[PDB]
Design a binder for this molecule. Structure first.
Ligand SMILES: [Mn+3]
Ligand SMILES: [Mn+3]
Length: 201
């Protein structure tokens, strides 16, 4: 899988200069590993759960797909998210791309996979990004519900699935028979990651 991507990588590392001349960007390498590091855990979700088995899909299209009339959806396209640091316009916030989602009837759920060493931060980092404007939309539905322009009010759900770089909590974050597959695939890349990190400091 995304291991085939890690494949094409671990090449470029184990042959390396000391970090003095080195690879000026171990970063491009580094970043690459992270993407892969994220994708392993994403993949697992994309099997056991998600509606998008393909790719992460924009929030606009999620909405239509949950059967919310475009004319209503373009309704909120010009508004602005409450308590936003950036003052985000829902227009933009519909181009946003969370990793995984699932519709069931009048309910919509997102799941964001992240992985760092700092759990709450990643959780914090992402909540800050989505949960603000997701409640919004949900609310701007009931608001549109109590006027009866929809049959049913929609419930919406954003959870972050975030896993220690080691994997220890994947027990608690995402129990799956794919688990033990994932933890081990992580360990491998991690060693690469750390290595590139220990070649600087
Ligand atoms: Mn993503
Ligand atoms: Mn993510």
């Amino acid at each position: 899988g995304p291991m085939e991507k890690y494949r094409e990588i671990h090449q470029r590392v184990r042959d390396l200069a000391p970090g003095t001349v080195s690879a000026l960007e171990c970063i491009d390498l580094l970043d690459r590993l992270y993407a892969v590091r994220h994708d392993l855990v994403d993949q697992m979700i994309k099997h056991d759960w998600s509606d998008n088995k393909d790719v992460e899909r924009p929030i606009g299209q999620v909405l239509l797909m949950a059967g919310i009339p475009n004319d209503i959806i373009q309704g909120m396209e010009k508004k602005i998210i409450p308590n936003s640091p950036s003052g985000q316009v829902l227009k933009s916030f519909f181009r946003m791309t969370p990793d995984n989602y699932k519709i069931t009837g009048n309910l919509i759920e997102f799941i964001e996979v992240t992985v760092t060493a700092d759990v709450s931060r990643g959780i914090r980092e992402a909540k800050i990004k989505y949960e603000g404007g997701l409640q919004f939309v949900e609310h701007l539905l009931e608001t549109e519900s109590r006027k009866g322009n929809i049959p049913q009010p929609y419930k919406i759900t954003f959870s972050v699935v975030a896993v220690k770089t080691d994997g220890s909590n994947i027990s608690t974050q995402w129990p799956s028979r794919r688990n033990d597959g994932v933890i081990q695939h992580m360990r491998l890349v991690q060693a690469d990651i750390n290595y590139v990190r220990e070649h600087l400091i």
